[PDB]
UniProtKB/Swiss-Prot annotation, chain B:
GO terms for cellular component: mitochondrial inner membrane; mitochondrion. Its EC number is 1.-.-.-. Fe cation 2 binds at E131, E182, E235, H238. It comes from the Eukaryota. The gene is AOX. The chain holds residues 32 to 299 of 329 of the full protein. Coiled coil: none annotated. Keywords: Disulfide bond, Electron transport, Iron, Membrane, Metal-binding, Mitochondrion, Mitochondrion inner membrane, Oxidoreductase, Respiratory chain, Transit peptide, Transmembrane, Transmembrane helix, Transport. Its cofactor is Fe cation. This is Alternative oxidase, mitochondrial. The keyword Cell cycle does not apply. Fe cation 1 binds at E92, E131, H134, E235.
Length: 267, 268
């Protein structure tokens, strides 16, 4: 049919690389977010009681990082403006899609060497990674950064990929918690923004939507900036739940159980 | 419903006891769709190398193939069904590792360069899945002894590490190594089918595991050979994708679109 032994039997397809269209659909797997704007309009700020040494430590530290990234970002002194907004979120998103990758592949590597059913935790992480990496590809179209923060970005990732690698190895409960808490704040970040556009204390100017984003979230032809944040928000909020649950499941020794969220595909 | 409701919950921990163990959820919905009498004719090819790098990959595949078949005493002994099943149980545990660094290193770069990737990552990923869906399938035909169970852990450390540092240095080398790897895979799985067909091997196992039913999509009637035939297809799917990839690299096209996104679909 479309794809069979005749292709399979050919040494290379290097000839067709000049002659395939860049599709913006091709930028992500076929696993897209598909919220309904009026609904995810209601997504709320939540908080989960830290349930021990680790949960609190995950909490504490996430909260000093916001402190230290808030002062250093300078995000602190001035208005909520599309600039230091896109600029902020953009940066965060470089780190935002790291945990999902290092988790998924660690579970992949367990599975492979101990020959066990992963029961679908892999893929759910591997999407969080892609999903945020997409969040990136969006923002990296509203406003490219400058050399100063392009560097900063490439040094942060170096540092973060050790932290998450070693920690995810030491305590996955710690990391899913750690991440749980970075989400809650991802909500707050974005949700406070939706409230600027609402209150008019910020007047968006990128009110089309990057084509990348528009297909991804099946966004309408002249969907506005706000609409965009609402899904970017929903996305995040889902990551919230999941990463506290995955952690709660580690809490009660369940890191080798069926992944709840597979079920919630039209169950 | 997957609405702000469930998004606003704290945790769904409490929900595990109710959710079923649906074999269909081990993998992503991205499933090799082969048509068997079609794929049947999957041939054994041999890509000519260019670089010294290609040469190297080729020797390092040869060398490991000799190493393995010897220390595994797979060469002689009246070829058994339960040494095919084992050798693939081991080999698909290494197999499931490069595609996964593959997709990981590329992944990270899209985020540190805030650049597009153009369909590479999800391909390299689902490979690492596909090679894992072999492993979970084989395990059902035979559980590894403690010798073997030990072998796979030690080997994961050598390999992973090796891949990881070859990936940073020579992406070309990895893609072409895998290519050549899979040129062997495809040799062996047609060997098996051939061996089966001349009744040199009589397949005691004909309960095709559920996992390989739902994942590959196959009637409850699909014989042992039917499995070998689909798996072997993927192995050749991997053989020419990674071999396209090594070529793509060698031609500074790392950042060109990944062609196989379109050869999913109909025309260009
Ligand atoms: Fe994010
Ligand atoms: Fe996030
Ligand atoms: Fe394989
Ligand atoms: Fe393979
Ligand atoms: O975020
Ligand atoms: O293989």
């Amino acid at each position: 049919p479309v794809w069979g032994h005749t292709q399979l039997n050919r040494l290379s397809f290097l000839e067709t690389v000049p002659v395939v269209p860049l599709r913006v659909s091709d930028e992500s797997s076929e696993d897209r977010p598909t919220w309904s704007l009026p609904d995810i309009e209601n997504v709320a700020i939540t908080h989960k009681k830290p349930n021990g040494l680790v949960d609190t430590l995950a909490y504490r530290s996430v909260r000093t990082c916001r402190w230290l990234f808030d002062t250093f970002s300078l995000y602190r002194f001035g208005s909520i403006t599309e600039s230091k907004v896109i600029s902020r979120c953009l940066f965060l998103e470089t780190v935002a899609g790291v945990p999902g990758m290092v988790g998924g592949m660690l579970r992949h590597l367990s599975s492979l060497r101990y020959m066990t059913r992963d029961k679908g935790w892999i893929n759910t992480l591997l999407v969080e990674a892609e999903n945020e990496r997409m969040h990136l590809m969006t923002f990296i179209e509203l406003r490219q950064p400058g050399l100063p923060l392009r560097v900063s970005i490439i040094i942060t990732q170096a540092i973060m990929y050790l932290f998450l690698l070693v920690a995810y190895v030491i305590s996955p409960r710690f990391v899913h918690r750690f991440v749980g808490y970075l989400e809650e704040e991802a909500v707050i970040t974005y949700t406070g923004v939706m409230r600027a556009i609402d209150e008019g204390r910020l007047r968006p100017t990128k009110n089309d939507v990057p084509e990348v984003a528009r297909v991804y979230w099946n966004l309408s032809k002249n969907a506005t900036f706000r609409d965009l944040i609402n899904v970017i928000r929903a996305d995040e909020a889902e990551h919230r739940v999941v990463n506290h649950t995955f952690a709660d499941m580690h809490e009660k020794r369940l890191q080798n159980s069926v992944n709840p969220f597979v079920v919630l595909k039209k169950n």
